Amino acid sequence: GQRWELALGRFWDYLRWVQTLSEQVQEELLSSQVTQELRALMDETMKELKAYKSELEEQLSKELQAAQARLGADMEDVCGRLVQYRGEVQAMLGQSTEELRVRLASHLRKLRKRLLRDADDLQKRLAVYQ
């Protein structure tokens, strides 16, 4: 798999871990190491892609780009969702976070179904373009 899928698979690896929302994920989630690494992995994912699409140009370009702006949104979504939780926690004064995490994890499962297909789609859309 080209540089971009390898990049996306690393994002997938870290997300799968976040999802478990174990106290350890929660620790680094509120320190925001989780969000910092999530954004570094998403960005490396968009370069290797940005570079792939551009270089597939040098040797249909709207949808491609409509499909790229999709996987983008999907990743920006996860990070934006994790950074929101962090926000809602340091403002609740230590009262229970279980319902906020039941919601975060549902939302997170939902974005996973999208990363799956929007990329599965982005892929066939890069193959035909070639």
Curated annotation (Swiss-Prot):
<feature type="binding site">
    <location>
        <begin position="111"/>
        <end position="114"/>
    </location>
    <ligand>
        <name>heparin</name>
    </ligand>
</feature>
<comment type="subunit">
    <text>(Microbial infection) Interacts with hepatitis C virus (HCV) envelope glycoprotein E2; this interaction is required for HCV infectivity and production.</text>
</comment>
<feature type="modified residue" description="Methionine sulfoxide">
    <location>
        <position position="92"/>
    </location>
</feature>
<feature type="region of interest" description="LDL and other lipoprotein receptors binding">
    <location>
        <begin position="107"/>
        <end position="117"/>
    </location>
</feature>
<feature type="modified residue" description="Phosphoserine; by FAM20C">
    <location>
        <position position="96"/>
    </location>
</feature>
<comment type="subunit">
    <text>Homotetramer. May interact with ABCA1; functionally associated with ABCA1 in the biogenesis of HDLs. May interact with APP/A4 amyloid-beta peptide; the interaction is extremely stable in vitro but its physiological significance is unclear. May interact with MAPT. May interact with MAP2. In the cerebrospinal fluid, interacts with secreted SORL1. Interacts with PMEL; this allows the loading of PMEL luminal fragment on ILVs to induce fibril nucleation.</text>
</comment>
<feature type="repeat" description="5">
    <location>
        <begin position="117"/>
        <end position="130"/>
    </location>
</feature>
<comment type="similarity">
    <text>Belongs to the apolipoprotein A1/A4/E family.</text>
</comment>
<feature type="glycosylation site" description="N-linked (Glc) (glycation) lysine">
    <location>
        <position position="53"/>
    </location>
</feature>
<comment type="function">
    <text>(Microbial infection) Through its interaction with HCV envelope glycoprotein E2, participates in the attachment of HCV to HSPGs and other receptors (LDLr, VLDLr, and SR-B1) on the cell surface and to the assembly, maturation and infectivity of HCV viral particles. This interaction is probably promoted via the up-regulation of cellular autophagy by the virus.</text>
</comment>
<feature type="repeat" description="1">
    <location>
        <begin position="40"/>
        <end position="59"/>
    </location>
</feature>
<comment type="function">
    <text>APOE is an apolipoprotein, a protein associating with lipid particles, that mainly functions in lipoprotein-mediated lipid transport between organs via the plasma and interstitial fluids. APOE is a core component of plasma lipoproteins and is involved in their production, conversion and clearance. Apolipoproteins are amphipathic molecules that interact both with lipids of the lipoprotein particle core and the aqueous environment of the plasma.</text>
</comment>
<feature type="repeat" description="4">
    <location>
        <begin position="95"/>
        <end position="116"/>
    </location>
</feature>
<protein>
    <recommendedName>
        <fullName>Apolipoprotein E</fullName>
    </recommendedName>
</protein>
<feature type="repeat" description="3">
    <location>
        <begin position="73"/>
        <end position="94"/>
    </location>
</feature>
